[PDB]
């Protein structure tokens, strides 16, 4: 929940409006922002927040196995069927293979799951979050995002900043983080900072963000592992010698 910097109490105040709706919402992000973290507090703060929170990543599977973790087949219930009620996130949204673009307009359309065999279909009841960093109306364009279903899951857009834009939060995070490393592995006072360990850090565009932030900041305060003097070498990358 850390962070003091307007661009992101700005989402705050977004995802508390949006959650008490059952309208779809698509988070814009690059990693390590806090997406999946933005769409449990959708969850929690919203009417279903008793119900399920269903996660998903859309790259991990094939498209066959997407195809039947999300829909289900024969039995072995999908995400959908595990989410009634409740919310199911959709992480990397724009790797889904165009044949599960389709099938999940007609579930968000129709509000049931179609199913094979003797069957009927099973209607479903599940408020739709998703995430991506990609450019949504570049593919649609491109023809590798449908446009219909853009028009109908973009209901609200939350776009959550990265830690370069930021700015000001990369100390505070970087000190909460120093912080809790210093008390794993028992060191007695986190000794701070020195101005070009605060270079380091304010500078380098963090591609991972605030994971990535997280462990430069513990992986630099364990070599340094002392409070008899302030940590002035950040690790960026451990590859090196
Ligand atoms: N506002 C925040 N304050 C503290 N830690 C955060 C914040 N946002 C994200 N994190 C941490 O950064 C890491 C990445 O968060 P996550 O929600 O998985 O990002 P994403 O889903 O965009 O990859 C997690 O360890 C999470 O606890």
């Not at 703060?45 to 195809?67: H, K, M, T, V, Y």
């Not at 889904?96 to 003797?118: C, D, F, S």
């Not at 279909?121 to 279903?149: H, I, K």
């Amino acid at each position: 929940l850390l962070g003091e910097a307007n661009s992101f109490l700005e989402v705050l105040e977004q995802v508390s409006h949006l959650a008490p709706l059952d309208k779809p919402v698509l988070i814009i992000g690059e990693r390590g922002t806090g997406k999946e973290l933005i769409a449990s507090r959708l969850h929690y703060l919203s009417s279903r927040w008793q119900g399920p929170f269903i996660s998903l990543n859309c790259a991990a599977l094939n498209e066959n196995l997407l195809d039947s973790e999300l829909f289900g087949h024969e039995r072995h219930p999908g995400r959908f069927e595990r989410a009634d009620g409740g919310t199911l996130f959709l992480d990397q949204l724009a790797t889904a293979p165009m044949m599960v673009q389709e099938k999940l307009l007609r579930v968000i359309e129709y509000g049931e799951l179609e199913r094979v065999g003797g069957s009927q279909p099973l209607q479903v009841n599940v408020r739709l979050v998703c995430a991506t960093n990609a450019d949504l109306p570049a593919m649609v364009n491109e023809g590798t995002f449908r446009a219909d279903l853009l028009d109908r899951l973009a209901f609200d857009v939350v776009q959550l900043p990265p830690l370069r834009e930021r700015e000001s939060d990369i100390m505070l995070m970087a000190e909460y983080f120093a912080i809790q490393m210093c008390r794993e592995i028992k060191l007695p006072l986190f000794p701070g900072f020195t101005e070009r360990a605060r270079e380091t850090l304010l500078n380098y565009r963090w591609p991972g963000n605030i994971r990535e932030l997280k462990n430069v900041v513990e992986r630099s305060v364990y070599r340094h592992g002392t409070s008899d003097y302030p940590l002035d070498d950040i690790i960026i990358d451990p590859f090196k010698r």
